[PDB]
Design an enzyme around this catalytic site. Structure first.
Site, PDB file in Angstrom:
ATOM      1  N   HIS A  84       0.848  -1.225   0.000  1.00 45.35           N
ATOM      2  CA  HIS A  84       0.000   0.000   0.000  1.00 45.35           C
ATOM      3  C   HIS A  84       0.875   1.263   0.000  1.00 45.35           C
ATOM      4  CE1 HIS A  84      -0.218  -0.096   4.621  1.00 45.35           C
ATOM      5  NE2 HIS A  84       0.270   1.104   4.324  1.00 45.35           N
TER       6      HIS A  84
ATOM      7  N   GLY B 101       2.666   6.489   9.574  1.00 43.72           N
ATOM      8  CA  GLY B 101       4.089   6.365   9.213  1.00 43.72           C
ATOM      9  C   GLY B 101       4.715   5.111   9.807  1.00 43.72           C
TER      10      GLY B 101
ATOM     11  N   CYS C 278       3.699   1.999   9.434  1.00 42.63           N
ATOM     12  CA  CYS C 278       3.521   0.831   8.543  1.00 42.63           C
ATOM     13  C   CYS C 278       4.905   0.340   8.082  1.00 42.63           C
ATOM     14  CB  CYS C 278       2.578   1.161   7.394  1.00 42.63           C
ATOM     15  SG  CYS C 278       0.878   1.463   7.952  1.00 42.63           S
TER      16      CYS C 278
END
Ligand code: T1J
Ligand code: T1J
EC number: 3.4.19.12
Lengths: 304, 304
Positions: free
Chosen positions: B41, B143, B145
């Protein structure tokens, strides 16, 4: 979102841990620049521990009696001195992995990370607070002595704690990196009782703010209080007094949540008087006091 | 003595964290050998996130669109592929700090350490369990991830988790390092409800053993039970069923404490039915289920 008991990344401290052996006693040392710091009781037989005279025990020791191993390589000890309850062993090699560092003496209620070590090898990392009775509630087996507590400010490790002792009640005592015990404890196997382990009020409030920020709001009440009224209730429940300095420190959390500090105090007061009624806050059935306001802001903002 | 929620030392994983940027999306990547792993993603606009077609989004991307930064040095991307819900970015430099590592897919109830990262920079480390509903209760801001979960076996890092998602209920979902989601979750900003977050029974028992080992014994009762009787009570309280495999796994803690597993089950049963009556176990007012039997043995023995 979510709120965890969070330790600093330990890598910078992992790179400083060595094994210190004197006779049959092995424990951990901290290697910064060309100095290895360890608990002075490394020189004691468990027999010595009952009434040790460390100056007299140390006279019988030479540089070559201190065996310092960093990984599976031996460091050459070219000097040794006692500073309070720590030994400083001068070695011939500067630690190539020395981070920027400070030695700081923390206050009760301050939190830090511990890197639990055995034979100079890291086993685990957890978050602690200096208790108001100057103990910490750690996890320390035999061989864990010389494990250190630290805070990190970006790339600067602030060393605040070295582990020395377990009290007969299974709580922990140790020194700053200048060898000075937190509280009244001494490195002797003698009767040492801790005072009242009070709750760190300012930390509970910070964590109540963390809970609101993360959507746990059920405990927010319709009341306010005053510092004096709140403090009467705090004392009754073995909570540390709240000062105006604590109110000022909570200001940014007050601002973010729009809950005045004295309102959050009145919510805490009702939780003390009424209990949790089987409910949880941030997955705890009791009020957590091992987050500082700074910790809550750090974790809620995302500092690295 | 003492028992703490303890993360693995994070240094070996700190040395693997990089920043991955695709357009305006920045998150974290894991650099092992000459491959950087990150959530796919990274290629989405928050607009894309509502119904992303990742194959179609990826066609519009080149090696030079993925900006990979390790400290303040850029890595050259010489290839990229999608494996399930992760991107593998081939870079021209092997990570010099690559530890011995495995990719493992853990089972619900398994615990691991998370190194929370922002812009490829470590912020904190905490201990988690894979919940029986295949969520984890983390601490993850925007942030975070590509932050990873791991176990360490001496010098071998087993990567079990990469962070992808926060569910609308503020619990967390992610993948193993082959890009396969734990549970039924998908990397799409859509209605995704978690199932029942049951208590990890075998872990509570392990932690009850940890408590006995550390002197907290008040809850030890005069009763025993059977697996079937205990399991009837477990279900009523949203506890996972206990199997003979769980009883076998607790064997060493049974042996160390001389408390038969079914006796400790009957103690747990009374705690479920009677509650804690305002008492604490290892400083908790609820029953902790985020220690495995292996965790309890490790921390009680002192493995490094
Ligand atoms: O407030 C209490 C409530 C119940 C029991 C014990 C206490 C004392 N707590 C305390 N915190 C201090 C900070 C600096 C100097 C002296 C201090 N005494
Ligand atoms: O036992 C329960 C008690 C209360 C609510 C829900 C459940 C279901 N728990 C459950 N664990 C499993 C493990 C493997 C396969 C299926 C499983 N279902």
């Amino acid at each position: 979102s979510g709120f965890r008991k969070m330790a600093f990344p330990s890598g910078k401290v992992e790179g400083c841990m060595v094994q210190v052996t004197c006779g049959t006693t092995t424990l951990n040392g901290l290697w910064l620049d060309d100095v290895v710091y360890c608990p002075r009781h490394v020189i004691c037989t468990s027999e010595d521990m009952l009434n040790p005279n460390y100056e007299d025990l140390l006279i019988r020791k030479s540089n070559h009696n201190f065996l310092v191993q960093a990984g599976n390589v031996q460091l050459r000890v070219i000097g040794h001195s006692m500073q309070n309850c720590v030994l400083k062993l001068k070695v011939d090699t500067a630690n190539p992995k020395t981070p920027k560092y400070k030695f700081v003496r923390i206050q009760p209620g301050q939190t830090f990370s511990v890197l639990a070590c055995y034979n100079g090898s890291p086993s685990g990392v957890y978050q602690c607070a200096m208790r108001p009775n100057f103990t910490i509630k750690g996890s320390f087996l035999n061989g864990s002595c010389g494990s250190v507590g630290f805070n990190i400010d970006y790339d600067c490790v602030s060393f605040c704690y070295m582990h020395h002792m377990e009290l007969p009640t299974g709580v922990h005592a140790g020194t700053d990196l200048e060898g000075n015990f937190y509280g009244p404890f001494v490195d002797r196997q003698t009767a040492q009782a801790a005072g009242t382990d009070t709750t760190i009020t300012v930390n509970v409030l910070a964590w109540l703010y963390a809970a609101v920020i993360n959507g746990d709001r059920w405990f927010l009440n319709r009341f306010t209080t005053t510092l004096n009224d709140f403090n009467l209730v705090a004392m009754k429940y073995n909570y540390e007094p709240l000062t105006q300095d604590h109110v000022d420190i909570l200001g940014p959390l007050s601002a973010q949540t729009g809950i005045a500090v004295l309102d959050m105090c009145a919510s805490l007061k009702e939780l003390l008087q009424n209990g949790m009624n089987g409910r949880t806050i941030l997955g705890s059935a009791l009020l957590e006091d091992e987050f500082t306001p700074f910790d809550v802001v750090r974790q809620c903002s995302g500092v690295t």
